[PDB]
Design a protein around this ligand. Sequence first.
Ligand SMILES: NC(=O)c1ccc[n+]([C@@H]2O[C@H](COP(=O)([O-])OP(=O)(O)OC[C@H]3O[C@@H](n4cnc5c(N)ncnc54)[C@H](OP(=O)(O)O)[C@@H]3O)[C@@H](O)[C@H]2O)c1
Ligand SMILES: O=C(O)COc1cc(Cl)ccc1C(=O)NCc1ccc(Br)cc1F
Length: 316
Amino acid sequence: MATFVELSTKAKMPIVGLGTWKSPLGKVKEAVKVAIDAGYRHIDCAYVYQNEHEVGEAIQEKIQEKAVKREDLFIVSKLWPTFFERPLVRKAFEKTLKDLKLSYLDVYLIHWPQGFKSGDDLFPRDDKGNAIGGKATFLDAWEAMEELVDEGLVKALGVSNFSHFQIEKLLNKPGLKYKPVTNQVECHPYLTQEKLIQYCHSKGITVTAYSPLGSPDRPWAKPEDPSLLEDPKIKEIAAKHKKTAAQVLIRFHIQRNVIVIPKSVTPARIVENIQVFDFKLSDEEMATILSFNRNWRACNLLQSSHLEDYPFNAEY
Ligand SMILES: NC(=O)c1ccc[n+]([C@@H]2O[C@H](COP(=O)([O-])OP(=O)(O)OC[C@H]3O[C@@H](n4cnc5c(N)ncnc54)[C@H](OP(=O)(O)O)[C@@H]3O)[C@@H](O)[C@H]2O)c1
Ligand SMILES: O=C(O)COc1cc(Cl)ccc1C(=O)NCc1ccc(Br)cc1F
């Protein structure tokens, strides 16, 4: 059972959540059930993962079996950037909500700040694989999502993969109704996001750390990529506490008051990943881990660098 980070809406976001990207059908259902049994209440989902219907089945089971109540679950999903045009925001959301079998979402995120060609081709690309842009912007999408909050279909809005420039663009938009409660970004010891975390916290925006384990299974992974789990310096700190490298990697975020969403479909690892509240990384250990910062992204999305609101060009 996790502690919480309080949002600006006063809602309580569990500090450890279950990731579901690449969780296969036929395993994600059992994964969600095992997580809930283990005390997970926060589940991180997305339209683009195309598995929300099976996550929904699992949540529903556990609710109808009285394992958990809905008010105690914290469900997050994301709007894919082929759906920034106003009517499409609603249709995509309704599909997400229907798949999850829920009456509301706790948080709804803009998945990426750059708009892609609108429609149900989720990855419009040219011959060379480069993303094809759409003219609708994240501010267009935001306007549409604010309706969902008005209607109570979504308790809070948030963003993902935003730089501080794009968050400023959002916060400084004349006539804003709702503020983002979180910015979900890649974060781990090779990409410590010190500047972006400092910025977000100063604006009352929490940070959710994705790929906390280095996303070691990701398709675009080349052999020369750094491995956090196998990192001797990470393993050293784990050994000190008789814990795993993964437990250290997760606890690292908890101690910066950053929400973290490790993905697994393996019951043993699902349980392991939330056994992070019976030990404490020392100030020196935290300092050591921070020093590992390489500004290395596992998720670069370079195929879209040519579009307007590419977030990773800026320093933070
Ligand atoms: N907003 C975005 O753009 C975005 C981008 C990426 C991810 N996310 C979210 O963040 C979540 C986490 O990121 P991620 O899935 O990219 O990678 P991650 O959580 O860093 O790593 C997941 C991988 O690590 C393995 N693993 C899990 N626990 C382990 C443990 N204790 N020991 C060893 N290996 C372990 C998993 O294997 P098994 O699953 O086979 O156990 C899986 O292959 C995603 O599922 C998704 O919900 C969001
Ligand atoms: O958000 C995540 O969890 C990781 O991101 C993805 C997830 C899924 Cl299920 C699928 C794809 C991505 C993902 O980010 N894929 C890379 C990619 C390639 C081409 C184009 Br036009 C866009 C694009 F984002």
